[PDB]
Structure formats: structure tokens, C-alpha cells
Design a protein around this motif. Structure first.
Motif, short mmCIF file in Angstrom:
data_model
loop_
_atom_site.label_atom_id
_atom_site.label_comp_id
_atom_site.label_asym_id
_atom_site.label_seq_id
_atom_site.Cartn_x
_atom_site.Cartn_y
_atom_site.Cartn_z
N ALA A 1 14.23 -0.21 -1.67
CA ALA A 1 13.92 0.10 -0.55
C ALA A 1 13.49 -0.98 0.36
CB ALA A 1 12.26 0.72 -1.23
N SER A 2 13.40 -0.58 1.41
CA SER A 2 12.97 -1.60 2.76
C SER A 2 11.74 -1.49 3.37
CB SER A 2 14.13 -1.56 3.85
OG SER A 2 14.31 -0.17 4.15
N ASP A 3 11.16 -0.21 3.55
CA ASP A 3 10.11 0.13 4.42
C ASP A 3 8.72 0.26 3.58
OD1 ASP A 3 12.37 0.49 6.15
OD2 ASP A 3 11.85 2.83 6.63
N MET A 4 7.91 -0.77 3.80
CA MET A 4 6.53 -0.81 3.24
C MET A 4 5.66 -1.24 4.42
SD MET A 4 5.23 -4.26 3.25
CE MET A 4 3.98 -3.95 1.70
N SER A 5 4.43 -0.77 4.31
CA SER A 5 3.18 -1.55 4.87
C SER A 5 2.10 -1.89 3.85
CB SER A 5 2.57 -0.58 5.93
OG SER A 5 2.24 0.72 5.33
N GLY A 6 1.41 -2.83 4.12
CA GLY A 6 0.29 -3.32 3.22
C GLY A 6 -0.58 -4.22 3.84
N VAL A 7 -1.62 -4.90 2.96
CA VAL A 7 -2.59 -5.87 3.40
C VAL A 7 -2.07 -7.23 3.07
CG1 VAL A 7 -5.01 -6.11 3.98
CG2 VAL A 7 -3.99 -4.46 2.23
N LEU B 1 0.89 -1.19 0.04
CA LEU B 1 -0.11 0.07 -0.03
C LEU B 1 0.81 1.36 -0.03
CD1 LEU B 1 -2.91 -1.20 2.20
CD2 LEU B 1 -2.93 -1.04 -0.29
N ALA B 2 2.08 1.28 0.71
CA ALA B 2 2.84 2.33 0.61
C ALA B 2 4.38 1.91 0.97
CB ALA B 2 2.61 3.33 1.76
N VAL B 3 5.07 2.61 0.25
CA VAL B 3 6.71 2.49 0.54
C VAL B 3 7.43 3.98 1.12
CG1 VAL B 3 8.70 1.88 -0.19
CG2 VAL B 3 7.10 0.53 -0.70
N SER B 4 8.02 3.83 2.08
CA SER B 4 8.81 4.90 2.48
C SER B 4 10.13 4.58 1.97
CB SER B 4 9.02 5.16 4.07
OG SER B 4 7.75 5.61 4.43
N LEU B 5 10.69 5.91 1.42
CA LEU B 5 12.27 5.69 1.03
C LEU B 5 13.06 6.26 2.00
CD1 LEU B 5 11.54 4.99 -2.12
CD2 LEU B 5 12.05 7.50 -2.71
N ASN B 6 14.37 5.75 2.04
CA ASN B 6 15.33 6.02 2.95
C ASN B 6 16.64 6.36 2.11
OD1 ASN B 6 14.46 5.51 5.58
ND2 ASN B 6 13.82 3.68 4.70
N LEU C 1 12.72 9.95 -5.91
CA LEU C 1 14.15 9.76 -5.67
C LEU C 1 14.87 11.18 -5.65
CD1 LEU C 1 14.89 6.41 -7.47
CD2 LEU C 1 14.94 6.61 -5.12
N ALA C 2 14.12 12.02 -6.47
CA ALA C 2 14.63 13.36 -6.65
C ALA C 2 14.56 14.45 -5.50
CB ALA C 2 13.95 14.10 -7.70
N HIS C 3 13.19 14.01 -4.77
CA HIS C 3 12.95 14.69 -3.63
C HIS C 3 13.96 14.32 -2.47
CE1 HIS C 3 9.25 16.69 -1.66
NE2 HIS C 3 10.26 16.53 -0.48
N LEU C 4 14.02 12.89 -2.66
CA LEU C 4 14.83 12.40 -1.68
C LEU C 4 16.47 12.89 -1.69
CD1 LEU C 4 15.18 9.90 0.45
CD2 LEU C 4 16.04 8.53 -1.37
N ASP C 5 16.71 13.61 -2.28
CA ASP C 5 18.06 14.44 -2.13
C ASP C 5 17.85 15.98 -2.22
OD1 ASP C 5 17.76 13.45 -4.85
OD2 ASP C 5 19.76 13.56 -5.21
N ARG C 6 16.79 16.50 -2.02
CA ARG C 6 16.49 17.96 -1.97
C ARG C 6 16.37 18.08 -0.39
NH1 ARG C 6 12.12 17.62 -5.89
NH2 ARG C 6 11.53 18.70 -4.15
N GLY C 7 16.62 17.37 0.61
CA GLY C 7 16.64 17.25 1.89
C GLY C 7 15.12 17.43 2.32
N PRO C 8 14.37 16.31 2.13
CA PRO C 8 13.17 16.43 2.58
C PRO C 8 12.72 16.63 4.40
CG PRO C 8 13.88 13.94 2.77
CD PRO C 8 14.93 14.99 1.94
#
Lengths: 341, 341, 341, 341
Positions: B66-72, B39-44, B326-333
């Protein structure tokens, strides 16, 4: 009666110093002070640094160096409760600090020691609060007893109080000075296996004789790689990292996952370097250690007595031979340098 | 009936990556495998580095990041007991670190993680051992749950598990990335003051709205002073040292005697640096923090629920917009970048 | 100029007491003594027992009860450094327990407290060693400050110092006396759930207004079940076992595996009782809690300030109404009985 | 090849039991199971209780008792990673429990063991998951190795893992069974001084031979008073309170301030009594202990090997002499009762 005058080693200046024999009146004991007749003083590497650098401290001149002594109580003030004349004592390195929380502030960490912010112990008598001494061990002579306040307690503080050493642990001791040797002895009495590193084969020979399980000559082989071989790649549970010159980065490679690394020294502006790989991935504790509190000292003293532990003394020096004793200090002694009165 | 085909972002190479969309069969579930609809993945941040540098890892190709997800949960194998179909779950960052001693060796510290030594989660279904999931928080949508297994858990692990943070403590959180902001949220839920450091007024203002008690712009003033002034010179109880922040030597000066500094990090090549003096005289515990184990995760999930903690998410992106994410991920979220399925 | 005479509630005997008003000279301050004008005194249940049974103590007569006060420093001795005139302070319940190891011996556990082995504080001025005071909270009036040295500190010591309570923990507080309610307030400030047990709906309703998440009437239902139901069978992370509450064997069943049970107590003759099974299979730490030391007190004071914690006071009585206050003290106060000067 | 049939000691009923020799087919190894050929089994007092009371457990009949074994790996399933044929192993007492948090709920603490909820080990071969064994110690024979899973680990768990025994500590061991003897040995290897209590002079003689520092015959003298004499009134740092029949109240009188008391047993509905005087005033930790987790087991095994520790075995019994071995169990053995195959 008691005598009117006493001798001390004293300096009007530091950095450089002119340390010498002076004679002054025995000071009067206040209501809570005790008077100890000094039998032994153990030198520490910091005394050389205070004498030669000043170490940033505000010193009261004439300054008398050294912090670790053992003696016999001569007189107690009207309200002294802790000791009577005749009791054997050793001094405490950090007088403020009785138990628990280290004194100092975030801005100003440096707690007050003997031979620094507080008077040193290199005189025939010492006149200090009753709460600044503990009972000496029953099983040691004056000289051996003088070694404990600083080196003994540091090793003990690192390994036991903070460290929780266990039987079966593998401990790396870096070098063969006072702290390192006491570390070896405390580790061994606790059932740990001890690995000593040196750049001297003669010193590794002596270390073997104290009961070191392994010696690594680090000018002859890669010690980190040897620790791996000796541990079946597991790494050391505890590393006494002393002088951090053979330092942190190497220690981080040697330490087991969740292991511990105690950094012991005194060096004013030394720089510690390490790779943030093992640090993150093995998640060790890296812990600054200087000395300990007097409840920790009293624990050590009891342990010393119950184990029959014998401090390693490189040489005892007569009182008038303090210049030579300080010189032996920059020559890297095996164990402690002690002055006998 | 279930789908026969699923899509994923994978790459046939690293350093550099060629991450494209790909469609393969839904894999077979073994006896102890569960099939989870993502359902979702968090990027690290490490996801970026794994793709660009490979980080000395042995990646199976095609490799999904990617390592971080949740789901059903959709289906379970014959023997699975942890979850039933329809259950809501989140991935465990370091699978098989269940509790206690961290895996690894002296020589080989690295452990195995999802999106690394093990397959990534940035796909439409995940098929993994039941033991590599925990029950999702009941109080959160999937985007929010997905933030926990790495960023959530690092801060929970540093501050509570290893840190024992108490109400009334002062905590310094460097930057405003994902670990920093869980740092603040968990510090505030524990009744501590949080001081946030940053190089951006806008981030500071956002931090303040989350309930940071103080924010320091490290480009305006020496943040060490401002910490002293803020804590009447005591300095800070717990400092979250996020490796690309303000420095180790800096937080050494800022930490309270006997306080704690958690080192949380990125690049596989950063070299630390610090003065010995504070490390010794002030004796903080310096502890590298590599995420955390599964029982800590379950603790964090429970606490998230009873606290009503809302993870900070900077932007939700659709599955198709991974490159943009991935672009957002290196603009300092400010907080977390999440991909919503 | 200061007054020459001061009043106090004292008694020439115990078991039973004959506590009356008396007026004697303001005592002389020694070099390290401070003179404190009393502004408030908190009564503790032990004050009653000391007066009625003597509690095997060696009391100097005339004996003044009570240990917990705050006030303004009026004068200091020549050598005093902790406080200046005009400073606001509170008494330390066990003077000279500064930090760390608790005083006492195997044979002779008892330590010395104010209003017991040492003089009481229920007088117009107190004259004691500087070391027996800490700085008062800045956020509180004197009545509120005076609640801390015993009740405040017991709960702080049980939950935070020894307890390491984390946000997300479930805590069970037995009754609504002074220690119980600081228990709740500190548990809520730490981000934990609090379950209050009581035999009175009115107390429960008052508890709820303080922010207890659940209250159980132990006379309506088996509170052990209600704890299970409340924690989905996990049972409670930390149980504050206040000796005249619901039982040790009861909280053994209610505690979570590896959870904690703090035993806090009154009568010098209560005998515990518990089944072995839970003690063993569930392995909680059971820890008797005798108040706490001075550094913990200073911690609690700081936290009270940064938290804005308001101690619960049932009734303020005037100095002249001590008897009335002693009466309130055994009608089960909701929180604290304080005497205001 | 391997053989088709195996022998086990087995019962169709408990409480009472009819344990006897049965012969059944060697079960098939699943994908992760290993097959161990049994060399030694150590009996534990709980096996008598399971056989004779049932101990509340839901048992699968035919039931085979016992939990502690050492053997040689005969065959591994297709996915076994932990062991190959030929490896020497011992079983783990609590299979679920790998490290950290004890399993069980607040309502239902009782974790699943071997010889209970899970099959016992009193058969020629045992077929269990790979994760339910650890490598046997290199330095011990089969018989000695079988003693560790339970008694060895309990003593170790109490003293080291939970306890943090230190060199110089004074430890009281209650009695001369398996747990107590391992306690004596682990305490001694750690540098502690050990005090044994007995109601047998012959058993105190043997204890002296293992290196006990002092023996107290508690039918001949007051042991608590003797502990005082032996400790200079300080009391014991750690007390292994076993059987809690010579129990808690007495232990609370003997324990030092801040000392530790580990309560070890199995007894289903025994009642522990203690005076709430020492409990409050000396503030010891009273800690329930049963066995430990397998990371703790693997620590012990390494320690055993590195120390040359030799488990005390009262008698080894041939496989066909299990009835006699169980009888020796109610006669109070000095150390362990072991069955050799």
C-alpha cells in the motif's frame, strides 16, 4: 494571350486506374480564383494509394492526382487580393485549414485534400481559390518548392509546431523518405542531434552527407539498443515514427521520459501495437500528425528562406514521364520525387 | 511518551504472498524523518498485483503493501521543517517526484513508489522523509484524504495538469473505479459534461447520482455511436482510457479531432491496439499517465478544499480486515476501498 | 417578399459625432453574403470612443456604430453554406480572424473590426459575408446572444483559451463592466474562486448575488492586502486587469508567482506602469488581450449552452432610444447595455 | 590530506561594503554536503548590487558574494549519491528550485539565491548540499563553465524553456552583456536570426563576429524602425529586453503580433513604461524572467556540450584581483567577467 487548351494526367477510374494524358479547355477563373502555370509537382505516397485503392474518397472523374505544386500566377479574378500575375506560388495540401483547429468531426475525421476530394495539380494550369496557395520561397527553384506543401510541412508540423524541438534534443528519424529527410534538416537547423535508421547502408551514407549525426542499420543491429548507447540511456526526445511498421512498441522503448513520438503515415487500416509499460511509465506524448495548416506552411517557407534549406530530391522527371515517376514511388526514394514542367 | 511496538500487514514472499499480521519496533526517525500515526489507507489495484506477481520489483522483505495513507504527525526529526507534531498529512505516491520532468530513463522507465521499491504504509505508524508527505485537505476526514495520492492525483494529472480541460468540454470516463470517479468529479467541477461507460446498470445509476450527465451500458449499445449522438458527431474532448475498459482503438474513433486520450493502466503486460486512420486524420494527443508529482498533489488538495469535493468510497474496513478489503478490491469497487485505523 | 427600406443610426462625421436616424435601401447580397434581421445589439465602450474620437480609424461615411448583434437570417446568396434562412446568428467582432495567429503587423498592429474599419450593426438588417457570423446559442434570447462577440469572447479568451484556468484557482476581476462579469461567470463555471474589486457597495452586493466569493471595496481597503489575506499570501492565480481599474503595478504585487495577468483595455493613449521586482521575481505572464477569434467564439457559444450561462444585462433599450443607451454606456453599466429590436 | 584553512572574499557590512581577503577554517561537510575546490567564479551584476545596496536581503556576515562557480569535488558526506570526489561541478543559482513552479509567495516573491540569502562562492572551497550543484559540461574549461548558472540559464530559460524559440524566428537581443550574448548564441544554434542593439560600434563589430545577423547602433538610428526594415514590417518574434531602460514601450512597438518579450534585469525599484496600444492589439506575451531551475540548467549543460557552445568571457581575473574584477563590472563588459583560481 493565354492558350485555349491544357494537358493533364487524368483517370476515369481508380483501383484500378487508367491514368493518361488528356487535353481539355483551360477552365475559367472565378472572381476569387487565380490561374497558375504549373512549373513543378512533387509526388507523395498517398497519390499511389488514391490511384490504386481509391482511399475511400468520393472522386470527381476525370480525376487528376497530386497535391503539391509550385508555379507562376498567370491571371487573377476581379477580387483577388493575395497575388498578382507573375508571383511565384505553391499550393496548400489542406485548403480548408488555415490555422488552429483541424477540420473534420469525431465520426468523420478525413479532411479534404488536393488530389482527392479536391482536384489534383498534375496539369499545365491549375485554377483554384486565391486562399489555396501561399507565396513560394524566394530562395528555391520550382522543383524544390513543390516539395514543401506536404512532406516539408508534416516534418515541420510534427517537430516545431506541435513538437517544440529544442537545440540539444536528440531526434530519431525513421527511414529516408521525404518526411524523414525534411525532419533531419529541420532538426539540424534547430540544433538537434539526429539519428537516422535504415535498412540500407548506401542510404545511411547519403544521410551522413546531409548532416545526420548517426545512422543505424536496423537489419544489422538493434536500433533501440543503439539509441540507448548514443544517448547514455536517456532515450530520444523526439521520434519521427513513419510507416509505424518499424513501429510503436519499439519507439516506446526508445523514447525518453516525457519525450514525444509523432506517428506519420497514410495507411488506411494499419494496426499500431505497443506495450503499455513505457507508455505508462515514461508518459510520452504519442501524437498523430498529418500535414499542417497554411499559417504553418507560411512559417516554414520563411524558415526555408532564412536558413538556406535545400529539399532533397531523388529525381526530377519530365512531364511526359509521370508513369515512371509513380513507379519510382514504390521503389523507396531517397527524398522527393518531382515532376518538372 | 510514544509506543514501543507497532503492527503491520507484511509478507516474507511474493508470487504468491503470505500476508499476515506482524509486530515490530517503531522505527527510529532520522533528522529529516517524521513519524506519522496512520489513520487510514486507500488500497490501489496495483497493491494486489505487487503481492501476487511482484511486478518485477526489488522488494525489501518483510514487505508491507500500500502507498496511499493519511494520518497525524507524532514526532519529527531535529531538522524537519515541513510539518510539526499534530499536523495532518498524506503520503506521496512517487516520492521525490516533486514537479516537472518525470524521473527515469529510456532503458529504465520505472520510478520508485511507496508500497513497491519503497516500504508500504499499511502499518500503525509510518516513518519516512518529510518530503514524502503533503498537508492533508482541511475539508476531509482521514479516510477521504487517503484516496488522493494515487487515484485522486491520476485524474487530476490527466485532466487538468496535462489536459487543460475547459468548461464546456465533453469527457468520457470508462468504468467506475477510483480514477474514473475522480475523473467525473473533477470534470464536473471544471464545468464539463461527463459521459460514463459501464457494464452495469447499478453502477450507472450510482454514477448518475454523483452527477454524470450520461451513462452508457457498453453491453447494450456501441458506446462509440452513443458518444457521437451525444456530441452531435463532434466526439469527445477528453477520454480517460482506463486500460481494462473499452479499448484504445475504440476511444480513437470516439475522440474529437485534436482531442485528448489519457491512457491510465494496470497489468505489466497489456498490449494496446488501434487503427492508424483516426490517430492520423483526427490527430489526438495520446498520453500515458503514470499518476503525478508532488506539486500537482498540493494543487489537487487545495482544489478539493475550495471545491468541497467528497472522494467516493465504496467501503471502509477495519485494520484487522485487510484480507476482506483485498477481496473487495477485485470485485470491482465503485470508487475506493479504504482501511480505517 | 422582403422590405425595400431599412433604418439605422449613422453619422456623417466623427469627433464629435452627429448620430441621427437614417433610412436607406436594404443592400444587395453578394454570392457569399447573408441578410440578417437584427434582433439585438450590445453596445461596447469602444463604440462611444469611435464616435467621439474616431480612434485613428478610416471610417466610411455615413458610418453606423456597434459590432455586437444577433438576429435571424432572412436571405442568403447563391453560394452561401454556413447558414440557411431562419437560422439564428451572432456577429464576429474581428471578421476574418478565424483561429490561431492574430492578424496585423509589427508596424500596423490594428486589426479590422465591425463598427470601425468595417460597417456597424446598429441597423434593422445587416448584410455581410457568411464568414462573419456564427450560430447563436440555443439557450439564450437575442438580447443575451448579442453580448457574446466582444465582452463574452474577451473573458473567454483571456481565462480559458490563453489562460487555461483550472478548478481551484483564485481569480481577481476588476470592476463590474461587461468583461468583468463574464470573467466571474466563466471563472465560477470552471470551479475557481472569484474575488471582485469595485468602488461601490451596491455593485459588490449585486456581484455577490451572481456568486462572487469575495468582493473588495478598493475605496475602503488596500485590495492587494485583502487578496493576500484571502489567499493565505499565495496571491491570485489569474487577474483580469481591466485598464481603468486598479493598476498594473497593483496587480503585479497581487499576482501569485508564475500566475497570469490579462490586460484588457479601452483608451488609445493609456500608459501602463509597474515595478520591475514582482515582474521579475514572481515571473507572471502578462498578456494583452484584444478580444478573440471565431473558433474561440464557437467554443464560448457551446459552453454557454451546456453550462446554462445567462449573460448579465443592465438594461434593454428600444431601437429608438440608442442615445439613452449611449448615455447609460458611460454611467458605468453593471454588465451589458443592449438595444432590442 | 586536505588543508585546514581557506581563503575567501568577505565583508562584515554592505552598502557600503568592505570586501577583503579573510582566512577561515574549511567547514565540515555534513552527511549530504559535498566539498568542492573552486576553480572559477563568474561575477554577475547583482553581486555589485548586494555589496553596494544590500538589496533588501538578510545576510549572514561575514558575507561572501557571487553565485556561479565551477570546481572539482574533493570530499562527499556519508550519504552523498549525486557526486564522487573528482567530478567536475557547477553550482546552481536558485538552490530550492529544482523544476516546475517558481518558489516564493504572492506577498514575498524573492527566492533565496547563492551570494545573498545563501552563502556566496568566492572562496577556495565551498561546502554545500549535493543537490545544489550539477555536473559541469564535459566540453568546457572551469572558467567557461562558471558562466552558465546565471546568465547562460536566464537566456536559455527565456528563449527555450518559456520561449520555445524556433528556427526561422527573428530575435532581438538588447545590448552585449552576459545574458544578451548567451541569447545570441542560443538563438543562433536554434536557427534563429539575431539582431543586436548597441550604443557601441566596436561592440557591434564583436557581435558580428559571434554570428549576429544584424547590429543596430541605437544612438545612430531608430532601432524599432530598423527592426521593421529587417523584418519586412513583421516585427521581432522574441525580444530579450534587458535593463528595460531601452525599454518596454519601444519593445512593444518592435514585437510581432503574438510575439514574446522577456524582461530580464535585477533592478529593485525600476519603473517599466509602455503604451497600451501594441500591448492590446498585437497581444504579445510579456514575461518576467529570472534565471531558471536546475533541470533547466542540466538541459543547458547537455546542449552546451552537444553544440560546442563557447561562453563569451570579457576577461579572466586572478583570485587576488577581485576588486578590479568588480570594477570591470560597472564598465559594461562584452560577455562575462570571470575569476580564475
Amino acid at each position: 494571350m493565354m492558350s485555349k487548351w491544357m494537358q493533364e494526367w487524368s483517370t476515369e477510374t481508380v483501383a484500378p486506374h487508367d491514368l493518361k494524358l488528356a487535353e481539355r479547355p483551360v477552365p475559367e477563373a472565378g472572381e476569387h480564383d487565380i490561374i497558375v502555370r504549373t512549373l513543378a509537382v512533387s509526388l507523395n505516397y498517398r497519390d499511389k494509394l488514391v490511384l490504386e485503392t481509391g482511399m475511400g474518397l468520393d472522386l470527381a472523374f476525370p480525376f487528376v492526382p497530386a497535391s503539391d505544386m509550385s508555379g507562376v500566377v498567370e491571371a487573377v479574378g476581379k477580387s483577388v487580393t493575395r497575388f498578382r500575375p507573375g508571383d511565384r506560388v505553391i499550393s496548400t495540401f489542406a485548403p480548408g485549414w488555415l490555422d488552429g483547429l483541424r477540420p473534420g468531426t469525431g465520426r468523420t475525421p478525413a479532411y479534404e485534400t488536393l488530389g482527392g476530394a479536391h482536384p489534383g495539380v498534375l496539369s499545365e494550369y491549375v485554377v483554384l481559390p486565391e486562399g489555396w496557395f501561399v507565396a513560394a520561397p524566394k530562395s528555391l527553384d520550382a522543383a524544390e518548392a513543390s516539395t514543401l506543401p506536404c512532406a516539408g510541412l508534416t516534418a515541420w508540423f510534427a517537430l516545431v509546431e506541435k513538437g517544440h524541438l529544442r537545440a540539444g534534443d536528440r531526434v530519431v528519424v525513421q527511414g529516408t523518405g521525404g518526411v524523414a529527410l525534411f525532419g533531419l534538416q529541420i532538426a539540424k537547423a534547430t540544433g538537434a542531434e539526429v539519428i537516422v535508421t535504415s535498412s540500407s547502408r548506401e542510404k545511411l551514407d547519403r544521410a551522413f552527407a546531409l548532416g545526420a549525426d548517426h545512422g543505424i542499420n536496423r537489419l544489422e543491429e538493434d536500433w533501440v539498443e543503439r539509441v540507448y548507447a548514443l544517448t547514455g540511456d536517456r532515450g530520444a526526445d523526439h521520434i519521427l515514427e513513419i510507416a509505424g511498421g518499424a513501429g510503436l512498441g519499439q519507439s516506446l522503448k526508445a523514447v525518453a521520459p516525457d519525450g514525444r513520438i509523432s506517428v506519420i503515415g497514410v495507411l488506411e487500416g494499419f494496426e499500431v501495437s505497443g506495450p503499455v509499460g513505457p507508455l505508462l511509465l515514461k508518459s510520452p506524448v504519442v501524437q498523430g500528425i498529418s500535414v499542417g495548416h497554411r499559417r504553418a506552411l507560411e512559417d516554414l517557407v520563411g524558415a526555408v528562406d532564412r536558413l538556406g534549406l535545400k529539399p532533397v530530391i531523388d529525381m526530377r522527371y519530365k512531364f511526359t514521364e509521370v508513369p515512371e515517376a509513380l513507379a519510382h514511388l514504390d521503389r523507396g526514394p531517397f527524398g522527393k520525387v518531382v515532376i518538372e514542367f
